Design a protein around this ligand. Structure first.
Ligand SMILES: [Cu+2]
Ligand SMILES: [Cu+2]
Ligand SMILES: [Cu+2]
Ligand SMILES: [Cu+2]
Length: 506
Protein backbone atom coordinates (compact mmCIF):
# COMPACT_ATOMS: atom_id res chain seq x y z
CA UNK A 1 0.00 0.00 0.00
CA UNK A 2 0.77 3.70 -0.55
CA UNK A 3 3.59 5.91 0.57
CA UNK A 4 2.29 8.81 2.61
CA UNK A 5 3.41 12.34 1.81
CA UNK A 6 4.91 12.03 -1.65
CA UNK A 7 2.44 14.20 -3.61
CA UNK A 8 1.95 17.95 -3.20
CA UNK A 9 -1.60 19.08 -2.19
CA UNK A 10 -3.59 20.38 -5.17
CA UNK A 11 -5.33 23.68 -4.65
CA UNK A 12 -8.28 23.82 -7.03
CA UNK A 13 -8.42 26.89 -9.26
CA UNK A 14 -11.10 29.44 -8.72
CA UNK A 15 -13.80 29.21 -11.41
CA UNK A 16 -14.03 32.20 -13.80
CA UNK A 17 -17.50 33.43 -14.82
CA UNK A 18 -18.74 33.00 -18.37
CA UNK A 19 -20.27 36.49 -17.99
CA UNK A 20 -20.23 39.05 -15.28
CA UNK A 21 -21.64 42.47 -14.61
CA UNK A 22 -22.29 44.60 -11.60
CA UNK A 23 -25.82 43.12 -11.65
CA UNK A 24 -25.12 39.48 -12.16
CA UNK A 25 -22.49 36.76 -12.35
CA UNK A 26 -23.05 33.76 -14.65
CA UNK A 27 -21.19 30.44 -14.41
CA UNK A 28 -21.34 27.12 -16.31
CA UNK A 29 -20.24 23.82 -14.82
CA UNK A 30 -20.53 20.56 -16.76
CA UNK A 31 -20.27 17.13 -15.11
CA UNK A 32 -17.72 15.08 -17.09
CA UNK A 33 -16.04 11.74 -17.13
CA UNK A 34 -12.41 12.42 -16.50
CA UNK A 35 -9.20 10.80 -15.39
CA UNK A 36 -6.75 11.91 -12.72
CA UNK A 37 -3.87 10.45 -10.84
CA UNK A 38 -4.62 10.23 -7.13
CA UNK A 39 -1.06 9.20 -6.06
CA UNK A 40 2.50 9.07 -7.50
CA UNK A 41 2.36 5.24 -7.60
CA UNK A 42 -1.17 4.70 -8.99
CA UNK A 43 -2.29 4.39 -12.58
CA UNK A 44 -4.66 7.26 -13.42
CA UNK A 45 -8.23 6.83 -12.04
CA UNK A 46 -11.53 7.18 -14.03
CA UNK A 47 -13.80 9.65 -12.16
CA UNK A 48 -16.72 12.01 -12.59
CA UNK A 49 -15.88 15.67 -12.09
CA UNK A 50 -17.35 19.14 -12.27
CA UNK A 51 -15.68 20.62 -15.38
CA UNK A 52 -13.59 17.48 -15.54
CA UNK A 53 -11.91 18.26 -12.19
CA UNK A 54 -11.70 16.41 -8.90
CA UNK A 55 -12.42 18.30 -6.77
CA UNK A 56 -14.56 20.70 -8.67
CA UNK A 57 -13.37 24.23 -9.16
CA UNK A 58 -13.62 26.37 -6.13
CA UNK A 59 -16.32 28.98 -6.47
CA UNK A 60 -15.80 32.36 -4.80
CA UNK A 61 -18.57 34.86 -4.23
CA UNK A 62 -19.36 37.96 -2.27
CA UNK A 63 -22.24 38.24 0.21
CA UNK A 64 -25.28 39.44 -1.81
CA UNK A 65 -23.52 38.72 -5.10
CA UNK A 66 -26.29 37.85 -7.55
CA UNK A 67 -25.02 34.46 -8.86
CA UNK A 68 -26.37 32.00 -11.47
CA UNK A 69 -24.77 28.59 -12.12
CA UNK A 70 -25.94 26.48 -14.99
CA UNK A 71 -25.17 22.97 -13.76
CA UNK A 72 -25.00 20.59 -16.76
CA UNK A 73 -24.74 16.82 -17.15
CA UNK A 74 -22.49 15.39 -19.83
CA UNK A 75 -22.01 12.06 -18.28
CA UNK A 76 -22.33 8.53 -19.65
CA UNK A 77 -25.73 6.89 -19.69
CA UNK A 78 -24.47 4.01 -17.51
CA UNK A 79 -22.81 4.34 -14.07
CA UNK A 80 -19.44 2.77 -13.16
CA UNK A 81 -20.45 2.15 -9.57
CA UNK A 82 -22.85 -0.43 -8.20
CA UNK A 83 -26.49 0.75 -8.44
CA UNK A 84 -28.96 -1.00 -6.13
CA UNK A 85 -32.19 -0.75 -8.08
CA UNK A 86 -34.25 -2.06 -5.19
CA UNK A 87 -34.08 0.95 -2.85
CA UNK A 88 -36.59 3.40 -4.38
CA UNK A 89 -39.49 2.53 -6.77
CA UNK A 90 -40.17 3.90 -10.30
CA UNK A 91 -38.72 4.42 -17.40
CA UNK A 92 -36.14 6.72 -15.92
CA UNK A 93 -32.48 7.02 -16.82
CA UNK A 94 -29.85 5.09 -14.85
CA UNK A 95 -27.72 8.17 -14.38
CA UNK A 96 -29.48 11.12 -12.75
CA UNK A 97 -27.84 14.25 -11.29
CA UNK A 98 -28.74 17.37 -9.39
CA UNK A 99 -26.37 19.86 -7.67
CA UNK A 100 -26.98 20.95 -4.06
CA UNK A 101 -25.17 23.96 -2.65
CA UNK A 102 -24.74 22.77 0.89
CA UNK A 103 -25.33 25.64 3.35
CA UNK A 104 -26.80 27.81 0.57
CA UNK A 105 -29.59 30.22 1.46
CA UNK A 106 -31.32 29.26 -1.79
CA UNK A 107 -34.75 29.46 -3.46
CA UNK A 108 -36.27 26.02 -3.45
CA UNK A 109 -36.13 25.29 -7.14
CA UNK A 110 -32.43 26.05 -7.03
CA UNK A 111 -31.63 23.95 -3.91
CA UNK A 112 -31.02 20.65 -5.73
CA UNK A 113 -34.07 18.73 -4.55
CA UNK A 114 -33.41 14.97 -4.91
CA UNK A 115 -36.33 14.63 -7.33
CA UNK A 116 -35.38 17.64 -9.42
CA UNK A 117 -32.69 15.52 -11.12
CA UNK A 118 -31.75 15.56 -14.77
CA UNK A 119 -29.90 13.31 -17.22
CA UNK A 120 -27.53 14.32 -20.01
CA UNK A 121 -28.54 17.64 -21.71
CA UNK A 122 -31.63 17.63 -19.50
CA UNK A 123 -33.27 15.13 -21.85
CA UNK A 124 -35.23 13.69 -18.91
CA UNK A 125 -35.97 15.47 -15.68
CA UNK A 126 -37.38 14.37 -12.36
CA UNK A 127 -40.81 15.34 -11.29
CA UNK A 128 -39.67 18.31 -9.18
CA UNK A 129 -37.32 19.86 -11.77
CA UNK A 130 -38.13 23.45 -12.82
CA UNK A 131 -34.96 25.08 -14.12
CA UNK A 132 -31.58 24.61 -15.76
CA UNK A 133 -29.79 27.67 -14.32
CA UNK A 134 -29.68 27.68 -10.55
CA UNK A 135 -29.86 31.05 -8.69
CA UNK A 136 -27.77 31.65 -5.54
CA UNK A 137 -28.43 35.15 -4.25
CA UNK A 138 -25.98 34.69 -1.30
CA UNK A 139 -27.98 36.82 1.12
CA UNK A 140 -26.23 35.20 4.02
CA UNK A 141 -23.22 35.28 6.32
CA UNK A 142 -19.70 34.73 4.97
CA UNK A 143 -18.96 31.03 5.18
CA UNK A 144 -17.59 27.84 3.79
CA UNK A 145 -20.14 26.08 1.71
CA UNK A 146 -19.60 23.15 -0.65
CA UNK A 147 -21.45 21.75 -3.62
CA UNK A 148 -22.18 18.17 -4.58
CA UNK A 149 -24.68 15.82 -6.21
CA UNK A 150 -28.00 15.22 -4.44
CA UNK A 151 -29.88 12.93 -6.80
CA UNK A 152 -32.46 10.58 -5.34
CA UNK A 153 -31.14 7.09 -4.51
CA UNK A 154 -27.78 7.96 -6.11
CA UNK A 155 -26.18 10.50 -3.79
CA UNK A 156 -23.69 8.20 -2.11
CA UNK A 157 -22.53 7.03 -5.53
CA UNK A 158 -22.39 10.27 -7.43
CA UNK A 159 -20.48 11.99 -4.62
CA UNK A 160 -18.05 9.04 -4.27
CA UNK A 161 -17.44 9.30 -7.98
CA UNK A 162 -15.94 12.75 -7.47
CA UNK A 163 -18.82 15.26 -7.63
CA UNK A 164 -17.78 17.64 -4.88
CA UNK A 165 -16.39 21.19 -4.82
CA UNK A 166 -15.98 24.17 -2.48
CA UNK A 167 -17.98 27.36 -2.63
CA UNK A 168 -16.86 30.29 -0.49
CA UNK A 169 -18.88 33.35 0.53
CA UNK A 170 -16.74 36.46 1.28
CA UNK A 171 -18.44 39.19 3.29
CA UNK A 172 -16.41 42.42 2.69
CA UNK A 173 -17.23 43.62 6.19
CA UNK A 174 -15.04 40.87 7.60
CA UNK A 175 -11.93 42.14 5.79
CA UNK A 176 -11.10 44.40 8.72
CA UNK A 177 -10.45 41.35 10.93
CA UNK A 178 -7.36 40.86 8.74
CA UNK A 179 -7.65 37.08 8.82
CA UNK A 180 -5.12 35.20 6.70
CA UNK A 181 -6.18 35.56 3.13
CA UNK A 182 -5.42 34.87 -0.53
CA UNK A 183 -2.70 32.27 -0.89
CA UNK A 184 -2.83 31.92 2.90
CA UNK A 185 -6.50 30.86 2.80
CA UNK A 186 -6.77 27.28 1.56
CA UNK A 187 -9.67 24.81 1.37
CA UNK A 188 -9.06 21.23 2.44
CA UNK A 189 -11.73 18.80 1.12
CA UNK A 190 -11.26 15.49 2.79
CA UNK A 191 -12.55 12.32 1.11
CA UNK A 192 -11.72 8.78 2.08
CA UNK A 193 -11.50 6.33 -0.82
CA UNK A 194 -10.65 2.71 -1.60
CA UNK A 195 -8.61 2.25 -4.76
CA UNK A 196 -7.82 -0.89 -6.75
CA UNK A 197 -4.28 -1.76 -7.97
CA UNK A 198 -5.30 -0.80 -11.51
CA UNK A 199 -6.21 2.65 -10.08
CA UNK A 200 -10.01 2.39 -10.41
CA UNK A 201 -12.35 3.32 -7.56
CA UNK A 202 -13.71 0.54 -5.44
CA UNK A 203 -17.09 1.03 -3.80
CA UNK A 204 -18.61 -2.10 -2.22
CA UNK A 205 -21.38 -3.78 -4.25
CA UNK A 206 -22.65 -5.66 -1.18
CA UNK A 207 -21.91 -5.71 2.56
CA UNK A 208 -19.56 -7.92 4.59
CA UNK A 209 -20.90 -11.54 4.66
CA UNK A 210 -23.14 -11.23 1.64
CA UNK A 211 -26.18 -13.16 2.87
CA UNK A 212 -27.26 -14.69 -0.46
CA UNK A 213 -30.69 -13.21 0.40
CA UNK A 214 -29.61 -9.69 -0.70
CA UNK A 215 -29.85 -8.16 -4.10
CA UNK A 216 -26.82 -7.64 -6.23
CA UNK A 217 -25.76 -4.92 -6.04
CA UNK A 218 -26.84 -4.06 -2.48
CA UNK A 219 -26.57 -0.74 -0.68
CA UNK A 220 -24.52 -0.84 2.53
CA UNK A 221 -25.19 1.08 5.68
CA UNK A 222 -21.69 2.47 5.98
CA UNK A 223 -18.57 3.04 3.89
CA UNK A 224 -15.00 3.25 5.29
CA UNK A 225 -12.24 4.01 2.80
CA UNK A 226 -8.80 2.50 3.20
CA UNK A 227 -7.13 5.71 2.07
CA UNK A 228 -7.50 9.39 2.94
CA UNK A 229 -7.36 12.06 0.19
CA UNK A 230 -7.18 15.79 0.53
CA UNK A 231 -8.11 17.88 -2.50
CA UNK A 232 -8.01 14.76 -4.62
CA UNK A 233 -4.61 13.35 -3.54
CA UNK A 234 -3.82 10.40 -1.29
CA UNK A 235 -1.97 11.56 1.84
CA UNK A 236 -0.48 14.73 0.36
CA UNK A 237 1.98 17.21 1.77
CA UNK A 238 1.61 20.98 1.66
CA UNK A 239 4.55 23.34 1.88
CA UNK A 240 3.68 26.32 3.98
CA UNK A 241 5.40 29.52 5.10
CA UNK A 242 6.24 29.95 8.73
CA UNK A 243 3.19 32.15 9.49
CA UNK A 244 -0.57 32.10 9.97
CA UNK A 245 -2.77 30.24 7.50
CA UNK A 246 -6.56 29.87 7.34
CA UNK A 247 -7.89 26.53 6.22
CA UNK A 248 -11.50 25.82 5.17
CA UNK A 249 -11.81 22.23 6.34
CA UNK A 250 -14.64 20.28 4.62
CA UNK A 251 -15.68 16.66 5.26
CA UNK A 252 -16.76 15.49 1.85
CA UNK A 253 -16.66 11.84 2.86
CA UNK A 254 -19.61 9.46 2.52
CA UNK A 255 -19.67 8.06 6.03
CA UNK A 256 -16.42 8.73 7.81
CA UNK A 257 -16.10 11.02 10.81
CA UNK A 258 -12.65 12.50 11.44
CA UNK A 259 -11.12 13.54 14.75
CA UNK A 260 -8.32 15.83 13.90
CA UNK A 261 -5.11 16.91 15.65
CA UNK A 262 -1.50 17.94 14.90
CA UNK A 263 1.20 15.31 15.74
CA UNK A 264 3.47 17.81 17.52
CA UNK A 265 0.55 18.54 19.95
CA UNK A 266 0.18 22.14 18.64
CA UNK A 267 -3.11 24.00 18.55
CA UNK A 268 -5.75 24.97 16.00
CA UNK A 269 -7.75 28.15 16.36
CA UNK A 270 -11.32 27.76 15.18
CA UNK A 271 -12.80 30.97 13.81
CA UNK A 272 -15.81 29.57 11.92
CA UNK A 273 -18.50 26.86 11.81
CA UNK A 274 -20.89 25.77 8.97
CA UNK A 275 -22.86 28.99 9.33
CA UNK A 276 -19.89 31.37 9.45
CA UNK A 277 -17.66 33.11 11.95
CA UNK A 278 -18.06 32.10 15.58
CA UNK A 279 -18.64 35.07 17.91
CA UNK A 280 -15.24 34.36 19.55
CA UNK A 281 -12.19 32.36 18.36
CA UNK A 282 -11.68 29.04 20.22
CA UNK A 283 -8.27 27.42 20.86
CA UNK A 284 -8.45 23.68 20.24
CA UNK A 285 -6.10 20.80 20.37
CA UNK A 286 -8.49 18.60 18.44
CA UNK A 287 -11.94 18.58 16.88
CA UNK A 288 -14.55 16.17 15.58
CA UNK A 289 -15.67 16.49 11.94
CA UNK A 290 -18.61 14.42 10.65
CA UNK A 291 -19.79 14.20 7.03
CA UNK A 292 -20.83 17.61 5.75
CA UNK A 293 -19.43 19.57 8.69
CA UNK A 294 -17.07 22.47 8.02
CA UNK A 295 -14.52 23.99 10.35
CA UNK A 296 -12.90 27.31 9.49
CA UNK A 297 -9.49 27.35 11.26
CA UNK A 298 -6.22 29.12 11.63
CA UNK A 299 -2.98 27.22 12.12
CA UNK A 300 -0.02 29.33 13.25
CA UNK A 301 3.18 27.95 11.77
CA UNK A 302 5.25 30.96 12.85
CA UNK A 303 7.29 29.10 15.49
CA UNK A 304 7.66 25.78 13.63
CA UNK A 305 9.90 26.78 10.71
CA UNK A 306 11.50 23.66 9.07
CA UNK A 307 9.21 21.16 10.72
CA UNK A 308 6.94 18.49 9.35
CA UNK A 309 3.69 18.38 11.22
CA UNK A 310 1.11 15.72 10.51
CA UNK A 311 -2.58 16.39 10.51
CA UNK A 312 -3.57 13.26 12.35
CA UNK A 313 -6.80 11.45 13.00
CA UNK A 314 -7.89 9.40 16.04
CA UNK A 315 -11.46 8.44 15.02
CA UNK A 316 -11.84 4.95 13.66
CA UNK A 317 -14.21 3.92 10.90
CA UNK A 318 -15.51 0.34 11.20
CA UNK A 319 -12.62 -0.48 13.56
CA UNK A 320 -9.81 1.21 15.51
CA UNK A 321 -7.80 3.70 13.55
CA UNK A 322 -4.71 2.39 11.91
CA UNK A 323 -1.54 4.47 12.62
CA UNK A 324 -0.03 3.65 9.30
CA UNK A 325 -3.10 4.55 7.16
CA UNK A 326 -6.28 6.32 8.25
CA UNK A 327 -4.66 7.89 11.31
CA UNK A 328 -2.97 10.21 8.78
CA UNK A 329 -4.65 12.99 6.70
CA UNK A 330 -1.87 15.21 5.34
CA UNK A 331 1.52 16.62 6.24
CA UNK A 332 2.58 20.23 6.54
CA UNK A 333 6.21 21.13 5.79
CA UNK A 334 7.09 24.57 7.06
CA UNK A 335 9.79 25.16 4.45
CA UNK A 336 8.35 27.82 2.07
CA UNK A 337 10.18 31.11 2.47
CA UNK A 338 7.98 34.07 3.53
CA UNK A 339 6.66 35.97 0.47
CA UNK A 340 6.09 39.02 2.66
CA UNK A 341 5.54 40.03 6.29
CA UNK A 342 2.64 38.17 7.92
CA UNK A 343 0.13 41.00 8.41
CA UNK A 344 -2.76 38.65 9.35
CA UNK A 345 -4.37 38.29 12.78
CA UNK A 346 -6.02 35.78 14.98
CA UNK A 347 -8.60 37.90 16.85
CA UNK A 348 -10.69 36.94 19.87
CA UNK A 349 -13.57 39.15 18.76
CA UNK A 350 -15.01 37.80 15.56
CA UNK A 351 -18.69 38.59 15.31
CA UNK A 352 -21.91 39.78 17.00
CA UNK A 353 -23.38 36.90 19.01
CA UNK A 354 -26.23 34.52 17.74
CA UNK A 355 -28.77 35.61 20.51
CA UNK A 356 -28.19 39.26 19.60
CA UNK A 357 -31.86 38.80 18.53
CA UNK A 358 -34.86 37.68 20.62
CA UNK A 359 -36.83 34.97 18.77
CA UNK A 360 -40.15 33.45 19.99
CA UNK A 361 -40.88 29.70 19.85
CA UNK A 362 -43.69 28.79 17.44
CA UNK A 363 -43.36 25.04 17.58
CA UNK A 364 -41.44 22.22 19.15
CA UNK A 365 -40.81 19.20 16.89
CA UNK A 366 -39.85 15.91 18.48
CA UNK A 367 -38.04 13.72 16.00
CA UNK A 368 -36.95 10.08 16.44
CA UNK A 369 -33.97 8.46 14.68
CA UNK A 370 -35.27 4.96 14.02
CA UNK A 371 -35.03 2.19 11.47
CA UNK A 372 -37.19 -0.69 10.31
CA UNK A 373 -35.75 -3.69 8.49
CA UNK A 374 -36.65 -4.63 4.94
CA UNK A 375 -37.77 -7.46 2.69
CA UNK A 376 -34.14 -8.65 2.39
CA UNK A 377 -32.97 -8.34 6.02
CA UNK A 378 -31.19 -4.98 5.57
CA UNK A 379 -31.58 -2.14 8.06
CA UNK A 380 -33.50 0.84 6.63
CA UNK A 381 -32.92 4.09 8.52
CA UNK A 382 -35.91 6.44 8.98
CA UNK A 383 -36.57 9.94 10.32
CA UNK A 384 -39.53 9.71 12.71
CA UNK A 385 -40.80 6.46 11.15
CA UNK A 386 -41.51 7.90 7.72
CA UNK A 387 -40.18 7.04 4.34
CA UNK A 388 -39.13 9.81 2.00
CA UNK A 389 -42.28 9.19 -0.16
CA UNK A 390 -44.77 9.52 2.74
CA UNK A 391 -46.74 12.76 3.02
CA UNK A 392 -44.67 15.63 4.35
CA UNK A 393 -44.79 16.20 8.12
CA UNK A 394 -42.05 18.75 8.89
CA UNK A 395 -44.00 21.91 7.90
CA UNK A 396 -42.76 25.04 9.62
CA UNK A 397 -44.07 28.52 8.96
CA UNK A 398 -41.86 30.97 7.11
CA UNK A 399 -40.57 33.64 9.45
CA UNK A 400 -40.98 31.52 12.57
CA UNK A 401 -38.58 29.86 14.95
CA UNK A 402 -38.91 26.21 16.06
CA UNK A 403 -37.00 24.05 18.48
CA UNK A 404 -36.30 20.58 17.11
CA UNK A 405 -35.61 17.80 19.58
CA UNK A 406 -33.80 14.93 17.99
CA UNK A 407 -33.90 11.67 19.87
CA UNK A 408 -31.23 9.11 18.97
CA UNK A 409 -31.98 5.70 20.39
CA UNK A 410 -29.47 4.08 18.00
CA UNK A 411 -25.99 2.78 18.73
CA UNK A 412 -24.32 5.35 16.42
CA UNK A 413 -24.02 9.10 15.84
CA UNK A 414 -25.95 10.82 13.07
CA UNK A 415 -24.95 14.14 11.56
CA UNK A 416 -28.34 15.65 10.98
CA UNK A 417 -28.54 18.35 8.34
CA UNK A 418 -31.28 20.84 7.43
CA UNK A 419 -31.35 22.63 4.09
CA UNK A 420 -31.79 26.39 3.76
CA UNK A 421 -31.32 27.35 7.38
CA UNK A 422 -28.58 27.48 9.85
CA UNK A 423 -29.45 27.06 13.46
CA UNK A 424 -28.18 27.45 17.06
CA UNK A 425 -27.49 24.48 19.27
CA UNK A 426 -29.17 24.45 22.69
CA UNK A 427 -28.13 21.27 24.50
CA UNK A 428 -27.66 17.45 24.56
CA UNK A 429 -29.00 15.12 27.19
CA UNK A 430 -28.83 11.38 27.88
CA UNK A 431 -31.68 8.88 28.25
CA UNK A 432 -32.84 5.29 29.05
CA UNK A 433 -32.70 3.58 25.68
CA UNK A 434 -34.25 0.21 26.49
CA UNK A 435 -37.03 2.16 28.21
CA UNK A 436 -37.52 4.40 25.15
CA UNK A 437 -37.84 1.39 22.74
CA UNK A 438 -39.94 -0.80 25.10
CA UNK A 439 -42.56 1.95 25.88
CA UNK A 440 -41.99 5.00 23.62
CA UNK A 441 -41.33 6.82 26.93
CA UNK A 442 -38.44 9.21 27.46
CA UNK A 443 -36.55 9.38 30.77
CA UNK A 444 -33.39 11.50 31.09
CA UNK A 445 -30.46 9.90 32.85
CA UNK A 446 -28.47 13.10 33.54
CA UNK A 447 -28.62 16.92 33.14
CA UNK A 448 -28.86 18.92 29.94
CA UNK A 449 -25.36 19.80 28.66
CA UNK A 450 -24.81 22.92 26.58
CA UNK A 451 -22.76 22.84 23.37
CA UNK A 452 -18.97 23.18 23.40
CA UNK A 453 -17.70 26.49 22.08
CA UNK A 454 -17.22 25.07 18.58
CA UNK A 455 -21.03 24.77 18.47
CA UNK A 456 -22.02 28.18 19.99
CA UNK A 457 -22.21 29.88 16.59
CA UNK A 458 -24.24 28.87 13.54
CA UNK A 459 -24.68 25.31 12.36
CA UNK A 460 -26.44 23.41 9.55
CA UNK A 461 -25.06 19.95 10.13
CA UNK A 462 -24.90 18.58 13.64
CA UNK A 463 -23.85 15.40 15.38
CA UNK A 464 -26.64 13.72 17.32
CA UNK A 465 -24.89 11.16 19.50
CA UNK A 466 -26.32 7.77 20.58
CA UNK A 467 -28.47 7.70 23.69
CA UNK A 468 -28.95 11.46 23.66
CA UNK A 469 -31.54 14.08 22.87
CA UNK A 470 -30.25 17.01 20.86
CA UNK A 471 -32.09 20.33 20.79
CA UNK A 472 -31.56 22.90 18.07
CA UNK A 473 -33.34 26.15 17.22
CA UNK A 474 -33.92 27.44 13.72
CA UNK A 475 -35.74 30.35 12.21
CA UNK A 476 -37.12 29.18 8.90
CA UNK A 477 -36.65 31.58 5.99
CA UNK A 478 -36.20 33.81 4.28
CA UNK A 479 -37.60 31.69 1.38
CA UNK A 480 -40.74 29.49 1.50
CA UNK A 481 -40.97 26.24 -0.50
CA UNK A 482 -40.09 22.58 -0.70
CA UNK A 483 -36.74 21.62 0.91
CA UNK A 484 -35.32 18.54 2.72
CA UNK A 485 -33.56 17.41 5.90
CA UNK A 486 -31.50 14.28 6.41
CA UNK A 487 -28.62 12.39 7.92
CA UNK A 488 -25.46 13.50 6.13
CA UNK A 489 -24.03 10.03 6.09
CA UNK A 490 -24.79 9.30 2.44
CA UNK A 491 -25.31 5.56 2.86
CA UNK A 492 -28.04 6.53 5.35
CA UNK A 493 -29.46 9.45 3.27
CA UNK A 494 -30.20 7.14 0.33
CA UNK A 495 -32.03 4.45 2.41
CA UNK A 496 -33.97 6.16 3.77
CA UNK A 497 -33.03 8.77 6.31
CA UNK A 498 -34.26 11.77 4.36
CA UNK A 499 -37.59 13.59 4.44
CA UNK A 500 -39.16 16.61 2.70
CA UNK A 501 -39.41 19.87 4.69
CA UNK A 502 -42.04 22.38 3.52
CA UNK A 503 -41.76 25.96 4.63
CA UNK A 504 -45.20 27.46 4.23
CA UNK A 505 -46.56 30.99 3.51
CA UNK A 506 -50.08 32.37 3.64
CU1 LIG B 1 -27.60 20.96 2.39
CU1 LIG C 1 -24.79 17.83 1.54
CU1 LIG D 1 -27.25 8.48 9.79
CU1 LIG E 1 -28.94 17.58 1.58
Amino acid sequence: TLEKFVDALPIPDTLKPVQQSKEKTYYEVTMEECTHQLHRDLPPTRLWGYNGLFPGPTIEVKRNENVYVKWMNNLPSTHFLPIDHTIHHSEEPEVKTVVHLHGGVTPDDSDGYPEAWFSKDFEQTGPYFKREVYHYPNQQRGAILWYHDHAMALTRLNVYAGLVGAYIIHDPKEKRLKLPSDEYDVPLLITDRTINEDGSLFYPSAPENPSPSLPNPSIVPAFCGETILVNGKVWPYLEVEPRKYRFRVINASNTRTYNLSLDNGGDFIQIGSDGGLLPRSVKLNSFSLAPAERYDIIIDFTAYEGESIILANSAGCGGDVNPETDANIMQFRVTKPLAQKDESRKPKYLASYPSVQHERIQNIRTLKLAGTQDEYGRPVLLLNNKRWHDPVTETPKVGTTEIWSIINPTRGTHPIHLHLVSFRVLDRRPFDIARYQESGELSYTGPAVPPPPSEKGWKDTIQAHAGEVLRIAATFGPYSGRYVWHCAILEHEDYDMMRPMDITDP
